Amino acid sequence: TLVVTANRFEQPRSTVLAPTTVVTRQDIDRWQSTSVNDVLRRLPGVDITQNGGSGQLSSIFIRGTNASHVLVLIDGVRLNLAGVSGSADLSQFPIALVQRVEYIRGPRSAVYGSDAIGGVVNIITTRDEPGTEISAGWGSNSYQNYDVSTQQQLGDKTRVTLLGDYAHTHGFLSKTLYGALEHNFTDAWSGFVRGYGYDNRTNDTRKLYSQSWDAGLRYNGELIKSQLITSYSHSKDYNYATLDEMKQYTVQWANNVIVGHGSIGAGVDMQMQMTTPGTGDGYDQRNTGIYLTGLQQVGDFTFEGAARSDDNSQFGRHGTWQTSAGWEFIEGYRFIASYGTSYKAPNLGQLYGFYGNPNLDPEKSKQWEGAFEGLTAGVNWRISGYRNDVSDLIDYDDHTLKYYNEGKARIKGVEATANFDTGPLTHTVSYDYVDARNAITDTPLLRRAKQQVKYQLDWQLYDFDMGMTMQYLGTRYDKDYSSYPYQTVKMGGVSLWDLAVAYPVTSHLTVRGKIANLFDKDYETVYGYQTAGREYTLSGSYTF
Ligand SMILES: CCCCCCCCOCCOCCOCCOCCO
Ligand SMILES: CCCCCCCCOCCOCCOCCOCCO
Ligand SMILES: CCCCCCCCOCCOCCOCCOCCO
Ligand SMILES: CCCCCCCCOCCOCCOCCOCCO
Ligand SMILES: CCCCCCCCOCCOCCOCCOCCO
Ligand SMILES: CCCCCCCCOCCOCCOCCOCCO
Ligand SMILES: [Mg+2]
C-alpha cells in the first residue's frame, strides 16, 4: 500500500489522488510471467502490441496515447532507452530483475520532466527478502530458464544481493547479472551501490548489451526525507549492419518534509545523454529540471500538486504542472478531479536525421480527469473519465522534406476497476474505453484497442494455488502493409484465457504450471505478425 513513483517518496496509495497499480514479486511468481509485457498488459489502461513473441519489438500505449508517451523508470531513473530514439520498449528487459512495479496514470511530467503523458511505469529491482533461491523453467516452445538469487548480510548493517539469470528459447536468448550492496549508516542514513547488465540475442540477428550502475544516499527521518541519487547506463544495440550506443548519466537531489497533514517537496534533476555517431555524427543532449511537490489533507478534502521547470539544451525551457482535489463526501466514497500538463521531447531522429529538424518544440498535452472511487459491501472500485488533448505533435509533412509540429490528437477515455472477494475466490476486474482520434481529421489513431476488459480470478483448492486470467482485446485499426499503398484494416479483437497453478511441496520447493492461450486461439496484436498461443510452461523454485 506504499508507493513512491508519485512523488519520489514513500506514501499511501489512499493518499495519491490518481489511479495506480502495484505489482509485487509474489504476484509475478503466481502469474508465472516471462516478459515485462506479460506483467503490464494485465493492468488498467495499458495495451501492448508486439511483432511476434518474446524478444520482438513491442510498443506500449497508455490510455490511447502514442508509443513514446509513457515514461519507463527503472528505480527511476528512466529506462536507459532514449531510443535509442526514442520510446520505451521493454521487450529486452529482463523480467528476472523485476521485484515490483508501480504504475500511475495521468500526467506526471511535473515531477519527472519529459516523457510522462498518460502514464508512468516504474520498474523497481530492489527487495527485502533474505535467503537464497534457485529456480528453473521448461516450456513448450524450446523455452528454458534457470535462475539463482540470494540476499544476505554480511555485516548486520550491510547487505548484498546477487542474482544471475538465463533465459532462451530457440530465437531469443537472455543472460543477466545483478549485484547490490545496501549499507545503513544509521537508523536514518543509508546508501547503495547497484550494478547490472544483460546480454540479449534476438534472431535478422540483434545483439544488445546493457549495463547500469547506480549509487545513492538516502535520509529518512521523523520529518525530513532526502535522497541523492546517481546513475549511469551504457547500452550497445548491434543490429545485423548498424550499431547504436548510448551512454546516460543522471544525477538528482530531492527533499521532502512532513508539514502538517501531508508534505511539501522539491528536487533538482539533471540528465546527460551521449549518443554515438551513426547511432540512431554524435550528439550530447543535456537536460536539467527543477520541481516542487505538495500533498495536503484538510477535513474531508485532499490536495496534491506538482510543478516543474525543465531546461533542455536543444529546445530550451519548458514548464509543467498538475493539480488534484479529492473530496470524501461520505465515509468510503470520494470524488476526485485532476488537471495536468505534460510534454514529450523531440528525439535524435526527428531532430538531426535525414529529415528535419533541429528547431522542433515539444509535443504538449493537457489532461482533465474526473473520478468516483468507493468501498461498497466489500468491493473496492473506481471509475474515471479522462480527456487528453495532445498538440504540437511532430509529424512528417510529406512535401518539403522535414519534420514539423502540426497535428493534434484528442483522447477521451473511461476506466473502471474493482476488486473483491466472494468465496475463497478473489476477483480483480477492469474495463477500459479509449476513444483516441486525430483531432484534425477526426479519424481513429491506429494500433489502439477501443475497449479492453481484464479479469483475474484467484483461489486455493487444497494446497493447490490456482489463478485464471481473462482478457478481451477489442477492435483496433492497423495498416495492411503487404501492399502499397498500405491501407487500414480492422482487426476484430479477441479473447484470451490463461491458467496458472501452483503447489507448495514441503516448504522450500514450489512447483508451478501454466497454460497460455487456453483455447489456442490465433490472433495478432500487430497485423502480419503471428502470435504464439498454445504454450505449456512447467516450472519450479527451491528456497533455503
Ligand atoms: C508549497 C507549494 C504547493 C504545491 C506546489 C505545486 C502546486 C502547483 O499547482 C498546485 C496548486 O494550484 C492549485 C492549489 O493546489 C495546491 C495544493 O497542493 C498541495 C500544497 O501543499
Ligand atoms: C506552482 C504553481 C505554478 C503553476 C501555474 C502555471 C499555470 C500557467 O499560468 C497561466 C498560463 O498563462 C501563461 C501563458 O501566457 C502566454 C502563453 O505563451 C506566451 C508567453 O507569455
Ligand atoms: C521550485 C521550482 C518551481 C517551478 C515551477 C514552474 C515549473 C513549471 O512551471 C509551470 C509551467 O507553467 C508556466 C511556467 O512556464 C511559463 C514560462 O513563461 C515564464 C515567463 O513568461
Ligand atoms: C458516485 C458515488 C456514489 C456514492 C454513493 C454512496 C452514498 C451512500 O453510501 C452508502 C451509505 O452507506 C450505506 C451502507 O449502510 C450502512 C452499512 O453498515 C452496516 C451496519 O450499519
Ligand atoms: C464520471 C466517470 C465517467 C466515465 C465513463 C462513464 C460515464 C459515461 O457517461 C457518458 C459517456 O460519455 C460520453 C462519451 O464518453 C467519452 C468521454 O470519455 C472521457 C473523456 O471525456
Ligand atoms: C460504472 C457505472 C457506474 C458505477 C460504477 C461502479 C464501479 C464499476 O466497477 C466496474 C469494474 O469494471 C467493470 C465496469 O464495467 C462497466 C463500466 O463501464 C463504463 C462504460 O463506459
Ligand atoms: Mg504537390
Beta bridge pairs of residue 174:
167, 200
The architecture CATH gives domain 1-124? Beta Complex (2.170)
Provide the phi-psi class of 358: left if phi over 0, else alpha when psi is between -120 and 50, else beta: alpha
Please give the torsion angle defined by the CA atoms of residues 497, 69, 338 and 100, in that order, rounded to the nearest 10 degrees: 50
How far apart are the C-alpha atoms of 233 and 333, rounded to whole Å? 44
Residue 28: in which H helix or E strand, if any? helix 25-31
- CATH number for the segment(s) 125-544: 2.40.170.20
If you search the block for the grid coordinates 529491482, which residue do you land on? 125
Q: H helices of 323-369, where?
A: 348-352
Place of cell 521487450: 91
Cell numbers found for residue 531: 502470435
In the numeric block, which cell numbers belong to residue 82? 532514449
Binding-site residues from annotation for cyanocob(III)alamin: 57, 59, 66, 84-85, 242, 447, 481
Whether residue 160 contacts residue 132, with contact meaning beta carbons closer than 8 Å, is answered with: no
Q: Which residues of 83-100 are buried (b: 16+ CB within 10 A; e: fewer)?
A: bbbbbbbbbbbbbbbbbb
Helices (H), 98-192: 109-112
Give how far the C-alpha of residue 65 lies from the chain's centroid of Cα atoms, to the nearest Å.
Answer: 14
Report the distance separating Cα 199 and Cα 126, nearest Å: 20
Strands across the sheet with 70-74, in order? 20-24, 100-105, 119-124, 70-74
The closest alpha carbon to 291, from 270, 272, 310, belongs to 310
Report how far ligand 3's centroid is from the alpha carbon of 307 (Å): 8
Distances (CA, A) of 302 to 237, 266, 305, 494: 46, 19, 10, 40
Element (H, E) at 27: helix 25-31
Instruction: Give the ligand 1 atom nearest the CA of 325.
Output: 15
CA separation for the pair 94, 166 (Å, rounded): 9
Best residue among 336, 382, 383, 452 to mutate for probing ligand 6, ranked by most atoms within 8 Å of CB: 383
State how far the Cα of 118 lies from the Cα of 115, in Å rounded to an integer: 9
The C-alpha cell of 334 is what? 470520494
C-alpha cell at 521: 486461439
Closest ligand to C-alpha of residue 400 is 7
> Closest Cα partner for 258 from 221, 302, 227?
221
Resolved by: X-ray
| Interatomic CA distance for residues 419 and 373, integer angstroms | 12
Domain ranges of the chain: 1-124, 125-544
Using CA atoms, how far apart are residues 148 and 505, in angstroms rounded to an integer? 19
Beta-carbon contacts of 453 under 8 Å, excluding residues fewer than 6 positions away, are 429, 430, 431, 432, 470, 471, 472, 474
Burial class (CB in 10 A: 0-12, 13-18, 19+), 378: exposed
CA of 434, nearest ligand number:
5
Contacts of 94 (CB under 8 A, 6+ apart): 165, 167, 174, 176, 198
Resolution of the solved structure (Å): 2.7
| DSSP letters spanning 48-67 | EEESSSTTS-EEEEETT--T
**Using an 8 Å Cβ cutoff, are 483 and 495 in contact?**
no
Closest CA to 286 of 321, 249, 244: 249
